[PDB]
Write an enzyme that holds these catalytic residues in place. Structure first.
Site, PDB file in Angstrom:
ATOM      1  N   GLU A   1      22.651  11.934  50.477  1.00  0.00           N
ATOM      2  CA  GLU A   1      23.673  12.133  49.449  1.00  0.00           C
ATOM      3  C   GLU A   1      24.500  13.359  49.833  1.00  0.00           C
ATOM      4  O   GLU A   1      23.953  14.352  50.314  1.00  0.00           O
ATOM      5  CB  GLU A   1      22.994  12.367  48.076  1.00  0.00           C
ATOM      6  CG  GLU A   1      23.895  12.957  46.933  1.00  0.00           C
ATOM      7  CD  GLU A   1      24.046  12.032  45.694  1.00  0.00           C
ATOM      8  OE1 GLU A   1      24.131  10.793  45.881  1.00  0.00           O
ATOM      9  OE2 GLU A   1      24.079  12.545  44.522  1.00  0.00           O
ATOM     10  N   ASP A   2      25.812  13.289  49.631  1.00  0.00           N
ATOM     11  CA  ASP A   2      26.710  14.394  49.955  1.00  0.00           C
ATOM     12  C   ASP A   2      26.496  15.546  48.982  1.00  0.00           C
ATOM     13  O   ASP A   2      26.390  16.707  49.377  1.00  0.00           O
ATOM     14  CB  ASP A   2      28.170  13.934  49.892  1.00  0.00           C
ATOM     15  CG  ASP A   2      28.491  13.119  48.631  1.00  0.00           C
ATOM     16  OD1 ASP A   2      27.604  12.902  47.769  1.00  0.00           O
ATOM     17  OD2 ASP A   2      29.654  12.687  48.505  1.00  0.00           O
TER      18      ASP A   2
ATOM     19  N   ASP B   1      25.422  17.095  41.581  1.00  0.00           N
ATOM     20  CA  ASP B   1      26.237  17.770  40.631  1.00  0.00           C
ATOM     21  C   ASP B   1      25.514  17.682  39.282  1.00  0.00           C
ATOM     22  O   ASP B   1      24.677  18.519  38.992  1.00  0.00           O
ATOM     23  CB  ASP B   1      27.616  17.120  40.610  1.00  0.00           C
ATOM     24  CG  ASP B   1      28.678  18.015  40.040  1.00  0.00           C
ATOM     25  OD1 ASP B   1      28.437  18.629  38.994  1.00  0.00           O
ATOM     26  OD2 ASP B   1      29.781  18.088  40.626  1.00  0.00           O
TER      27      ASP B   1
ATOM     28  N   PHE C   1      35.083  21.997  41.725  1.00  0.00           N
ATOM     29  CA  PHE C   1      35.137  20.662  42.298  1.00  0.00           C
ATOM     30  C   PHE C   1      35.635  20.838  43.719  1.00  0.00           C
ATOM     31  O   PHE C   1      36.610  21.580  43.925  1.00  0.00           O
ATOM     32  CB  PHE C   1      36.063  19.740  41.501  1.00  0.00           C
ATOM     33  CG  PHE C   1      35.904  18.275  41.846  1.00  0.00           C
ATOM     34  CD1 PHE C   1      34.932  17.501  41.212  1.00  0.00           C
ATOM     35  CD2 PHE C   1      36.731  17.670  42.793  1.00  0.00           C
ATOM     36  CE1 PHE C   1      34.778  16.137  41.521  1.00  0.00           C
ATOM     37  CE2 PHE C   1      36.587  16.297  43.118  1.00  0.00           C
ATOM     38  CZ  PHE C   1      35.616  15.537  42.486  1.00  0.00           C
TER      39      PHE C   1
ATOM     40  N   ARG D   1      39.495  13.033  51.759  1.00  0.00           N
ATOM     41  CA  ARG D   1      38.253  12.773  52.490  1.00  0.00           C
ATOM     42  C   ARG D   1      38.355  13.240  53.931  1.00  0.00           C
ATOM     43  O   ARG D   1      37.366  13.683  54.520  1.00  0.00           O
ATOM     44  CB  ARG D   1      37.852  11.298  52.445  1.00  0.00           C
ATOM     45  CG  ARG D   1      37.330  10.835  51.110  1.00  0.00           C
ATOM     46  CD  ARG D   1      36.655   9.471  51.237  1.00  0.00           C
ATOM     47  NE  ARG D   1      36.631   8.737  49.971  1.00  0.00           N
ATOM     48  CZ  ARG D   1      35.708   8.887  49.033  1.00  0.00           C
ATOM     49  NH1 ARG D   1      34.702   9.735  49.203  1.00  0.00           N
ATOM     50  NH2 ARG D   1      35.782   8.166  47.925  1.00  0.00           N
TER      51      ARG D   1
HETATM   52  O1  LIG Z   1      32.435  18.650  43.492  1.00  0.00           O
HETATM   53  C1  LIG Z   1      32.595  17.441  43.846  1.00  0.00           C
HETATM   54  N1  LIG Z   1      33.561  17.071  44.699  1.00  0.00           N
HETATM   55  C2  LIG Z   1      33.778  15.781  45.120  1.00  0.00           C
HETATM   56  N2  LIG Z   1      33.035  14.737  44.698  1.00  0.00           N
HETATM   57  C3  LIG Z   1      32.030  15.006  43.836  1.00  0.00           C
HETATM   58  C4  LIG Z   1      31.069  14.096  43.204  1.00  0.00           C
HETATM   59  C5  LIG Z   1      31.029  12.587  43.379  1.00  0.00           C
HETATM   60  N3  LIG Z   1      29.868  12.009  44.006  1.00  0.00           N
HETATM   61  C6  LIG Z   1      28.508  12.440  43.731  1.00  0.00           C
HETATM   62  C7  LIG Z   1      27.559  11.474  44.431  1.00  0.00           C
HETATM   63  O2  LIG Z   1      28.025  11.336  45.781  1.00  0.00           O
HETATM   64  C8  LIG Z   1      28.177  12.491  42.236  1.00  0.00           C
HETATM   65  C9  LIG Z   1      26.850  13.214  42.136  1.00  0.00           C
HETATM   66  P1  LIG Z   1      26.275  13.513  40.451  1.00  0.00           P
HETATM   67  O3  LIG Z   1      26.082  12.123  39.863  1.00  0.00           O
HETATM   68  O4  LIG Z   1      24.975  14.224  40.727  1.00  0.00           O
HETATM   69  O5  LIG Z   1      27.283  14.345  39.743  1.00  0.00           O
HETATM   70  C10 LIG Z   1      30.291  14.936  42.408  1.00  0.00           C
HETATM   71  N4  LIG Z   1      30.684  16.247  42.486  1.00  0.00           N
HETATM   72  C11 LIG Z   1      31.724  16.358  43.336  1.00  0.00           C
HETATM   73 MG   LIG Z   2      34.219  10.552  44.995  1.00  0.00          MG
END
Ligand SMILES: O=c1[nH]cnc2c(CN[C@H](CO)CCP(=O)(O)O)c[nH]c12
Ligand SMILES: [Mg+2]
Ligand SMILES: O=c1[nH]cnc2c(CN[C@H](CO)CCP(=O)(O)O)c[nH]c12
Ligand SMILES: O=c1[nH]cnc2c(CN[C@H](CO)CCP(=O)(O)O)c[nH]c12
Ligand SMILES: O=c1[nH]cnc2c(CN[C@H](CO)CCP(=O)(O)O)c[nH]c12
Ligand SMILES: [Mg+2]
Ligand SMILES: [Mg+2]
Ligand SMILES: [Mg+2]
Lengths: 227, 228, 228, 227
Positions: B144-145, B148, B197, B210
């Protein structure tokens, strides 16, 4: 002119031609020690693949110039190609970009599956996010290899339903096999001889995707990892 | 040393690189795409440091799994870059120390998962349906990237469990210090980051940014410009 | 926009990345050669961030020189890595925007210069003698890894001047906030760093550590171990 | 066994053989637009060069194992080779290193000069730090190319004076030319056909050193940049 006749390759530049007897000894390059018994030779080294993909990205950039297009990665095998292509496209676009410029592409993933061992099953399974998001878009399909051309004829036939503005094909390898249906891509890396290749994300039964170079699996490898 | 199997507890996880609230770099310190400048406040984590940290993360992963077959699961689209650099370093590390008797280390899988609109979670997760029974009785590593809210992982781990997998561990590139966090921890974690963010390195705002190499903060002008 | 020609004044130089006194990373955050750990206190600047910053530095250089022929002079041995990454990015940048009517941007030169023993300047600079009259009437860009005391550059710029060069500008990767500093400034500068002796990215302690990827602080045990 | 018979290449593995007709169209890869009129074709792409150097570093590491040696970069042309070789050697050594391990190499630079246009002047000029620092050391010479073999016979003859423990040669390219004196290296990347190559740090009169790929300069390029 953005291409829009999938399978015709109307104005495609010639690929690098890889001859029937071309390639390198396994001992010329780094090979995972355990993979070595299952490979006959290196066909196309990792480095030429990257150098060639770079030019493809340039070729692509030159066609699309600044028009928004949408890149589809045909998973799992085209992953290596797709990441390399993206890297290069972004750098080329962003190096020449000015303050008034725009982002160049969106990215999408479609899993496409048809092979068992070294052959097409002549059937096709697909899994993606809803492709209705492609309506009215320029679409660039990124496929690792064209072999029988079944994957793409069938896939491009499915895409016609969704009112996509344009469909163009980028392909890393095209195999000179008598099984080919005539489907040509619009951007092509290499024309290769008729052998089953592994590496650079291309597998034999989920094996070898990690091999850096494009190589020919030998019969022992095919036997050892038969489905 | 054991394979993690408490998804969300991060029981034995190493500390990530800590990115302080005031940490960052001016946009003019690094290469930034010209059209992107006006929409970013600063660079939070440069591309290169991200890559060096993925390298160590892969070494950590290899120190846990050793030669044991495992299956790496990419959460699309935002984890692509992370996942990519991870495959690269894991293979090199595994394949450099490999011997003629060795075997491959991992398989690779992709699930597309979606829940954000603009800069917030919709609270509902879209999972693109694929039969994951090829994973029955397997060690799976989720890539997972970012963590949050923790919603993505809490829900996805529930989903995955129904497939009767052997173990579930989590590799996460970033973990955000937001009050929204539900407490889900990863077992290998790159950076702890402030509550802003972020975009770049495959992470988007409404499909934008991206392609940006560095992890940067989108400013409010960019958030308004690209609002859905 | 003009080509610098006040060696040591850094008249129009951009600010470097500022590395605070407390900045750094634990050794276990990144890949570190196993035998090197015991001799280092911490990572000061990761390899990747060094590379991203050389990239911007090259863009700055290209924004000053434009298409004007210039000659890049590498101060061996410690500037090798810096010099290398600089050539790479300058060529890509120059050659990406090149047109069929364009010409090459630069020549490349090497002088070996030596003055350190252990962690201190001997106060005398060894210059390996080469005829530099190929540089007469040329723009020269000196590439130096680090400015510490400033002795190397003060002396080397005196030397260079006798060759009747057109201009002299200075690209420096690091510049140290040490009281020993004589005030010599570079025209393009990567990082401002705290007063600690650093190794890695081609910088040595008694010929050791050059191969280390990251800029790290040698500890006192390593300084004693490898004392000349 | 660390090599120590300069010019014999006693136990050297075969290089990648690059055939007389091998190579690629200029349009297959990225080429600086302005360089394109001065090049006939690409001989060996940047990427194969890097992939091949990686294996050389491995070959080298395997011979020296953990013995301290000293690497000499023969400037200016072997710079690309030398930086690539160092990168790979360090990663290979440091990836397999344990807490009780030692540093593997020292590094030194010697400028060697003999060519005018596309030919050796049959004379040799050299500038380096005092080579007495090599007394009692294992020394690895890194040379971009062996052509007439004059540079190395002459250079290795000079080195005999300084009581160096061992002298071994790594060479990226070796040219199949009838002008060759028989000097073989101990580690060799590629055997190439008899044409003057540029790129990857190799020049024609200080030009082309920046070209990423190894290419054949055409007659117009030779004429345009004649001394
Ligand atoms: O700070 C950010 N920047 C860009 N994309 C995201 C995302 C979108 N993508 C996340 C899963 O890859 C959501 C994680 P969750 O459900 O734990 O909040 C969350 N936070 C950020
Ligand atoms: Mg996204
Ligand atoms: O030589 C090969 N090696 C590895 N995989 C494949 C595949 C499987 N994957 C291809 C789409 O990604 C099938 C293309 P099609 O439907 O035209 O034969 C075909 N040939 C090869
Ligand atoms: O912190 C350090 N680490 C490693 N090497 C050096 C050197 C050695 N090399 C410098 C020129 O490349 C001396 C610069 P000067 O004459 O301005 O002090 C200086 N400081 C350091
Ligand atoms: O094909 C070529 N291209 C570019 N440079 C050279 C050189 C010049 N540089 C070589 C040492 O770096 C001379 C090797 P020697 O003394 O055995 O001919 C020779 N051949 C070529
Ligand atoms: Mg397959
Ligand atoms: Mg030094
Ligand atoms: Mg030359």
């Amino acid at each position: 002119p953005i291409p829009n006749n999938p399978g015709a390759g109307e104005n495609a530049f010639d690929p690098v031609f890889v001859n029937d007897d071309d390639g390198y000894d396994l001992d010329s390059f780094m090979i995972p020690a355990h993979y070595k018994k299952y490979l006959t030779k290196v066909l196309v080294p990792n480095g030429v693949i990257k150098n060639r993909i770079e030019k493809l990205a340039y070729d692509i950039k030159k066609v699309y110039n600044n028009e928004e297009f949408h890149i589809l990665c045909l998973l799992k095998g085209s992953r290596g190609f797709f990441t390399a292509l993206l890297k290069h496209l972004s750098r080329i676009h962003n190096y020449s970009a000015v303050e008034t410029s725009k982002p160049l592409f969106g990215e999408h993933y479609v899993r496409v599956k048809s092979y068992c061992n070294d052959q097409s099953t002549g059937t096709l399974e697909i899994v993606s996010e809803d492709l209705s998001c492609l309506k009215g878009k320029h679409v660039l399909i990124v496929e690792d290899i064209i072999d029988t051309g079944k994957t793409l004829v069938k896939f491009c036939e499915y895409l016609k339903k969704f009112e996509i503005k344009t469909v163009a094909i980028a392909c890393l390898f095209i195999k000179r096999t008598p099984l080919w249906n005539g489907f040509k891509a619009d951007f092509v890396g290499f024309s290769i001889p008729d052998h089953f290749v592994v590496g650079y994300s291309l597998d034999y039964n989920e094996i070898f995707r990690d091999l850096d170079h494009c190589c020919l699996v030998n019969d022992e490898g095919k036997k050892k990892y038969k489905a």
